[PDB]
Amino acid sequence: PTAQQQLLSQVRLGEATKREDLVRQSLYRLELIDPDNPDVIAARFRYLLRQGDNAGAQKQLDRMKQLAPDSAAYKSSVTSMTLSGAEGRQALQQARLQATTGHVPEALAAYDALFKGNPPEGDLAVEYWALVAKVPARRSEAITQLKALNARNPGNAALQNSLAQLLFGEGRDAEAYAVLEQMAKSSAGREAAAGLWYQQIQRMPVSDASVKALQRFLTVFSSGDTVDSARTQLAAQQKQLAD
C-alpha cells in the first residue's frame, strides 16, 4: 500500500478510536504530501467539525468544492455538514427512529432524503448502503458501495457477513467466498463465516463437486463445530459413492 493510504487509514482508526493524536499526526504529514487530495481535505474537514470550528470546516468545504465538486469525498462532506447541526441532525434522528421501530421503507425514504446517495463517512455509510441493499433494484450498486467500504475499513464482521450473504443472494459465489475467507483470517466471525459456507453446501446435491466443495471448506476452516459436522458428512458423502 502507498504511504498516503496508510496515513488516511490511520486517520480513520483515530476517528474510530476517539484518539485525535493519531488524527493530528496523520493529517500533519498528509497535508505536506498531498494537500489537494479531497480525502485529505475531507479528513481535516471532519476534524475541524469535531472541534466545533465550523468556519475552518466551511473553508475546507469550499476548497473541496472548487477542487473536486463531484468526488464522493466532497458530497459526503456536504452531508456531514448538513448534519453538523440543527435540522439535519433531527432528520437523522427521525430516520433512525423509523429504522429501529421496523418502518423500513419509511426509514429508507428518510435516509434517501438526507444522504441523497452519499452518506457521511464511517458506520452511517455502512447502515445506509445495507438499508439500500434491501431494495432489489438498487441492490447491485449498493453491493458495489459495500465492497468499497469493506476495502476502506477492513475487519468488519457484520458488514462482511451482509456482503457475503448479498453476494450469495445474487449468485456471485466467488466474491462471497472471498469475503468469507477475509472473515476467516480474523477471529471475529469465523463461526459465522463457517456457518454461511456451510449452508451453501447443504443446498447442493450429494455429488463429486459437493464433496470437493466440502473438502475445500475443510481447507479454509480447521476447527469449530460446523467443521466437525463438515467432516462427518464429508465421510458420509464420499462413502455414498459406489453404493
Residue numbers in the entry: 26 to 268
Reproduce passages from the article.
BC-producing bacteria have a cellulose synthase operon in their genome. BcsC consists of about 20–30 residues of signal peptides, followed by about 750–900 residues of periplasmic domain of tetratrico peptide repeat (BcsC-TPR), and about 380 residues of the outer membrane domain of the β-barrel (BcsC-C). Thus, the TPR domain is believed to be important for exporting polysaccharides.
